[PDB]
Symmetry: C5
Subunit: 114 residues, 5 copies
Amino acid sequence: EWTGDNTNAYYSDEVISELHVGQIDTSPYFCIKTVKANGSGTPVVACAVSKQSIWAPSFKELLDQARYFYSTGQSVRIHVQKNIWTYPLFVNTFSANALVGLSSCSATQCFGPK
Amino acid sequence: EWTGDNTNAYYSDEVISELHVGQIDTSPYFCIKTVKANGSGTPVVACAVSKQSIWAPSFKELLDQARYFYSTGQSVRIHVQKNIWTYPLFVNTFSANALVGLSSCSATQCFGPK
Amino acid sequence: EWTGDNTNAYYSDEVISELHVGQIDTSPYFCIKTVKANGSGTPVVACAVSKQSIWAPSFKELLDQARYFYSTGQSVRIHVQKNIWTYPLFVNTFSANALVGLSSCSATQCFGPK
Amino acid sequence: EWTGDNTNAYYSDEVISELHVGQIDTSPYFCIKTVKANGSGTPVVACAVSKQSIWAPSFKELLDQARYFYSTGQSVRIHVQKNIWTYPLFVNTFSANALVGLSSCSATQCFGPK
Amino acid sequence: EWTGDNTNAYYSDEVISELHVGQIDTSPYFCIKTVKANGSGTPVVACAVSKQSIWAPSFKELLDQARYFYSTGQSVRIHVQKNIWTYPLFVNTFSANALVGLSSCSATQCFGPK
Ligand SMILES: CC(=O)N[C@@H]1[C@@H](O)[C@H](O[C@@H]2O[C@H](CO)[C@H](O)[C@H](O[C@]3(C(=O)O)C[C@H](O)[C@@H](NC(C)=O)[C@H]([C@H](O)[C@H](O)CO)O3)[C@H]2O)[C@@H](CO)O[C@H]1O
Ligand SMILES: CC(=O)N[C@@H]1[C@@H](O)[C@H](O[C@@H]2O[C@H](CO)[C@H](O)[C@H](O[C@]3(C(=O)O)C[C@H](O)[C@@H](NC(C)=O)[C@H]([C@H](O)[C@H](O)CO)O3)[C@H]2O)[C@@H](CO)O[C@H]1O
Ligand SMILES: CC(=O)N[C@@H]1[C@@H](O)[C@H](O[C@@H]2O[C@H](CO)[C@H](O)[C@H](O[C@]3(C(=O)O)C[C@H](O)[C@@H](NC(C)=O)[C@H]([C@H](O)[C@H](O)CO)O3)[C@H]2O)[C@@H](CO)O[C@H]1O
Ligand SMILES: CC(=O)N[C@@H]1[C@@H](O)[C@H](O[C@@H]2O[C@H](CO)[C@H](O)[C@H](O[C@]3(C(=O)O)C[C@H](O)[C@@H](NC(C)=O)[C@H]([C@H](O)[C@H](O)CO)O3)[C@H]2O)[C@@H](CO)O[C@H]1O
Ligand SMILES: CC(=O)N[C@@H]1[C@@H](O)[C@H](O[C@@H]2O[C@H](CO)[C@H](O)[C@H](O[C@]3(C(=O)O)C[C@H](O)[C@@H](NC(C)=O)[C@H]([C@H](O)[C@H](O)CO)O3)[C@H]2O)[C@@H](CO)O[C@H]1O
Ligand SMILES: CC(=O)N[C@@H]1[C@@H](O)[C@H](O[C@@H]2O[C@H](CO)[C@H](O)[C@H](O[C@]3(C(=O)O)C[C@H](O)[C@@H](NC(C)=O)[C@H]([C@H](O)[C@H](O)CO)O3)[C@H]2O)[C@@H](CO)O[C@H]1O
Ligand SMILES: CC(=O)N[C@@H]1[C@@H](O)[C@H](O[C@@H]2O[C@H](CO)[C@H](O)[C@H](O[C@]3(C(=O)O)C[C@H](O)[C@@H](NC(C)=O)[C@H]([C@H](O)[C@H](O)CO)O3)[C@H]2O)[C@@H](CO)O[C@H]1O
Ligand SMILES: CC(=O)N[C@@H]1[C@@H](O)[C@H](O[C@@H]2O[C@H](CO)[C@H](O)[C@H](O[C@]3(C(=O)O)C[C@H](O)[C@@H](NC(C)=O)[C@H]([C@H](O)[C@H](O)CO)O3)[C@H]2O)[C@@H](CO)O[C@H]1O
Ligand SMILES: CC(=O)N[C@@H]1[C@@H](O)[C@H](O[C@@H]2O[C@H](CO)[C@H](O)[C@H](O[C@]3(C(=O)O)C[C@H](O)[C@@H](NC(C)=O)[C@H]([C@H](O)[C@H](O)CO)O3)[C@H]2O)[C@@H](CO)O[C@H]1O
């Protein structure tokens, strides 16, 4: 598996606008909401769960990087894998998207896969 | 279990106004006091205790997040489970609430379960 | 044991003014000095040693919180247990106080046991 | 092995201009892009991958240091070992360079193996 | 062993002016360069290696404290043990000094052993 697999999805020129931390099934988790830097479009919601999914190994690195980009407000590309989380009330509150990567973006491109 | 279980309680549009770190019965712990951003209501107190209660796995994540939201003064939703801590002097100083989640808030919503 | 045990000692309305990190007996340790926010009184010195005393489990949380309050310069209540450290040159440089808690203070009260 | 081995390569007077975090083949990784502080030259890209390559033990220290130098934007010397990553889509997006060291370039010259 | 052993050396009122992170013999390490706050004298260089020397246990605490003092620019007392590192190209680049402690300094005296 790789963040950049074309079976994942990504959204460019976004800003992390909200942050949530909690616990589910004895696992810490966090979620972020991102919006376009220009405010257009629909928010992207993605979560990472410390003990669950093939992306569990990257939990701490992604939590620290989400916190960093949240604090700076800078433009990023957010990479997700769709249809991962399945607890129905959790998906209703957040989404089924697993967070799988974060890339900084300049005005002309983003530093990350496609 | 989940932060968003309907048997937990939550308080929206709160500001983390105080922070305390200590040790009890071999466990580092922290407590926070939150107050409504608009001055309404009565303060909420919640604590997380390392290696104690079902919420133990998220101790470090919640401590780091509470420190961040405390440092910014931003409005948050605080999620608790009531009647968890039983040590009587501790409860009298702080409360029996276990901290189980923290959510950022916007002008119209908070980014977490309700 | 608890930070708030009345056999411990505390000092309100203090500012963390100095910070030292070192090693002793293969254990990382740190010490702080605090002074009254209003400039009066006698400084308080307290140390924490990663592998020593009943307070060892809280070493990392107290170090992070000491660094936080040191960086903000805000007024705090410092909680200690007297007569813990015993190596004479160490006590002469610093003190025998073990650090056991740190509480934020407002103008009127401190958020911690009293 | 050593960061300063002559078989490694380095680039002075660079600024960390982009940062990416993801996961590949069970491993969290990060990549950085650096450009000459004075605007000349060609960017350098380097990556560190947890639990992969001989440089695995320093993954967390290099991630933390890359973040710090990225946040200040100060001039640095980046140390790499060429031709380490072989995953072809990854190399095309980023590079085959393993990040093996970071040195400040305050004042006089770069504070690292030369 | 202790940071304050009289067989160690220390240098007061120093400013951390450079920082380097790398790897050697499968161990992360860092080095700092310090200079007197008034610019007199000659620089002090010291390094910490995570898996080597009796000071290995305090590697992370020292790296975190070095980063903090490097970012503030405040005057510190640096404590070292001489003639510890032995790889010749490493010693010639940096020094043989092991970093063994870091103390903040008031306007009149440093907060650590002397
Ligand atoms: C490397 C390469 O060949 N092309 C990339 C390319 O991805 C991208 O070009 C377009 O740039 C605009 C704004 O910069 C958008 O980025 C475009 O749409 C994308 C995006 O956000 O990147 C593409 C993405 O695949 C889409 N994801 C899904 C699930 O559909 C999203 C999504 O539709 C929207 O984001 C929702 O609002 O849109 C993109 O085509 C740029 C980006 O920097 O860089 C090129 O090099
Ligand atoms: C390929 C695909 O999309 N899904 C398959 C699916 O056939 C199946 O799903 C998993 O199987 C059982 C229940 O049938 C597990 O209980 C998983 O449920 C949980 C889990 O405990 O792991 C419940 C948990 O609440 C979920 N966490 C959240 C935040 O929602 C997790 C989580 O979605 C997964 O762990 C993510 O990978 O799932 C259930 O998903 C199994 C059977 O082979 O395989 C899937 O791939
Ligand atoms: C994987 C592991 O280590 N432990 C899981 C364990 O988490 C799981 O417990 C369930 O976890 C879910 C979240 O994933 C909920 O927190 C459940 O709370 C319940 C409850 O226990 O009463 C269940 C569910 O949320 C609801 N009722 C159901 C499914 O019947 C109610 C809730 O009030 C709703 O509002 C009504 O829909 O709360 C909790 O049971 C257990 C059981 O799946 O499995 C372990 O593997
Ligand atoms: C009438 C009047 O106003 N007298 C003032 C008085 O307000 C004040 O006394 C101190 O006030 C602070 C208020 O935060 C504390 O209540 C001090 O009590 C404590 C403390 O919390 O710091 C109690 C504690 O048990 C004591 N610790 C030990 C080991 O004995 C400490 C300690 O004695 C002092 O902190 C050391 O300086 O005191 C209370 O003493 C002061 C000035 O504000 O003195 C009068 O002017
Ligand atoms: C030989 C000499 O000159 N002095 C030693 C003295 O160092 C030491 O004192 C006592 O030893 C018993 C156990 O033998 C206690 O454990 C205490 O020792 C130590 C310890 O646990 O290592 C010594 C250590 O230096 C102390 N650490 C600091 C920072 O001061 C700790 C510490 O106070 C406690 O751990 C706190 O709970 O205590 C001490 O009572 C012994 C060495 O055999 O004998 C003297 O002669
Ligand atoms: C203790 C442990 O876990 N592993 C060591 C292992 O690190 C050590 O390897 C030597 O490490 C030193 C630094 O301490 C040098 O990096 C040596 O590097 C070499 C190199 O990597 O190529 C070896 C030799 O000196 C030269 N190259 C060879 C023989 O291929 C070059 C040359 O000096 C540089 O180019 C200088 O610019 O450096 C490395 O062998 C081994 C052997 O000491 O012992 C393990 O236990
Ligand atoms: C003034 C003139 O005529 N030409 C200058 C030229 O002298 C100068 O070259 C660079 O100067 C800097 C000074 O810090 C470095 O010394 C560069 O050396 C190194 C470097 O450390 O960056 C050495 C290193 O071994 C080289 N790495 C590799 C893989 O070969 C790098 C690398 O070639 C360059 O960094 C790539 O751009 O160079 C030295 O080259 C500069 C002015 O600063 O450019 C001309 O104007
Ligand atoms: C508990 C563990 O894991 N290891 C300890 C080990 O740390 C300890 O070594 C002693 O540690 C103390 C600090 O706790 C000092 O660093 C000691 O240095 C001394 C020394 O050289 O012996 C100790 C003492 O203060 C003095 N020695 C005397 C009076 O004989 C000298 C002093 O500075 C003068 O220079 C002497 O003329 O410093 C160090 O030995 C050992 C022994 O306690 O126990 C292990 O278990
Ligand atoms: C004779 C003199 O002038 N000084 C000596 C010194 O040369 C000598 O070297 C030590 O001897 C041991 C014996 O096994 C090893 O050779 C040590 O090797 C290494 C190691 O641990 O791998 C090599 C390594 O590269 C070194 N790391 C760095 C950053 O340089 C480490 C490190 O220095 C030690 O671990 C420090 O504790 O050492 C080598 O140090 C011995 C002779 O006993 O000490 C002086 O007297």
